[PDB]
Amino acid sequence: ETWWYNPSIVVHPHWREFDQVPDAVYYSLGIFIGICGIIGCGGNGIVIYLFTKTKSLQTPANMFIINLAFSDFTFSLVNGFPLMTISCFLKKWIFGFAACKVYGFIGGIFGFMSIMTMAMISIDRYNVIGRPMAASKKMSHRRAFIMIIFVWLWSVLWAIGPIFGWGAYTLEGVLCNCSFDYISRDSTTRSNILCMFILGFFGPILIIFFCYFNIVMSVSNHEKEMAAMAKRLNAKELRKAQAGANAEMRLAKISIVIVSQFLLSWSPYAVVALLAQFGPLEWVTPYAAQLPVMFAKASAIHNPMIYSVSHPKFREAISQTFPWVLTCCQFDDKETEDDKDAETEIPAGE
Ligand SMILES: CCCCCCCCCCCCCCCCCCCCCC
Ligand SMILES: *C/C=C(C)/C=C/C=C(C)/C=C/C1=C(C)CCCC1(C)C
Ligand SMILES: CCCCCCCCO[C@@H]1O[C@H](CO)[C@@H](O)[C@H](O)[C@H]1O
């Protein structure tokens, strides 16, 4: 007697009043997310593969990048094909309630994980760039490792709530994927939602700003200091130190872009969410929630691409392993020069 009938999950009444979006929409959605899965898993596999095998990229900090890639790989995997894609092509979620929970639970856990991982990357950047050259700190495997343990502890904490009643993962949009329940306005769900948002999200965002705004408010602190030591009897060997800071600033610059990618990726959705939980639910329509979530899912597939066009060592690696990828973004040795000077160690001060 209806088109949203799911014998496994109880569809919130809100999604039931609307009319079924057109077949083309379902087919496109599936095809769309199915490509997020391919590019997402491919691109992140490529970054994990290269970052773990290439000795040039073998630095403690990079572990965070590995962690971010494993996070996005999984997101793209579980969230694209087959769970959602297949659902779409049938215009129905057919994998049951447990699959739904797992689906939504994985979705949030790694979403939180990627920003909190980016947080750690923002903190690393602050050590080697935000502080002065005199006290610059490089990430140590020990530090890094504990840091990713925080990331995993954390992420799971703010996404597991619904698994235990404190909130709930269920069907949303055109009913072919799952997420957290942002409609149901009771106490339990509202605190979890406020929690997910404030701790899972606003949380690492502060870390991010505090670190970058701290790296900008030290650009000059370093600009002056670079000269003080410059004329401080520092020979041609000064050039070395200079390329290194250029090197790091390049990675620091990268950080912000992948983070920017994230925000611009999740904010839309986050917003439509809160509207439904606090504002005009008549606003939160099929496409009002759907499309902005799609855009949110594809987020886990941009990092690999940002690296492929802005990471020298990594781009070097691709050129040497899957060069057919860097076609439209051809690699050149000159892109690795700054790392040469920075690493080349002057013997006995020459
Ligand atoms: C399940 C059936 C899939 C049919 C796909 C037909 C598509 C042709 C695609 C060729 C795909 C190569 C994908 C692996 C490469 C990962 C791309 C990610 C971009 C990474 C940039 C560093
Ligand atoms: C297909 C999408 C799924 C399974 C999404 C689940 C998402 C969450 C539990 C989202 C949490 C958030 C972030 C990771 C960042 C932005 C803000 C939130 C609170 C919406
Ligand atoms: C894009 C996210 C940036 C991740 C920061 C990785 C930090 C690795 O930065 C690396 O530090 C090494 C010394 O520890 C330097 O020798 C490398 O040139 C530099 O790329």
Author numbering: 9 to 358
The authors write:
Rhodopsin is the primary photoreceptor molecule in the visual signaling cascade. The activation process of rhodopsin is initiated by the photo-isomerization of the retinal chromophore from the 11-cis to all-trans configuration. The primary photoreaction state (BATHO) relaxes thermally through lumirhodopsin (LUMI) to an activated state, META, which in turn stimulates the heterotrimeric G protein to activate the enzymatic cascade in photoreceptor cells. Indeed, bovine rhodopsin is hydrolyzed to free retinal and apoprotein after photo-activation, whereas the Meta state of squid rhodopsin is thermally stable. It is noteworthy that whereas signal transduction in vertebrate vision is mediated by the second messenger cyclic GMP, signal transduction in squid photoreceptor cells uses an inositol-1,4,5-trisphosphate signaling cascade in which photoactivated rhodopsin stimulates a Gq-type G protein.
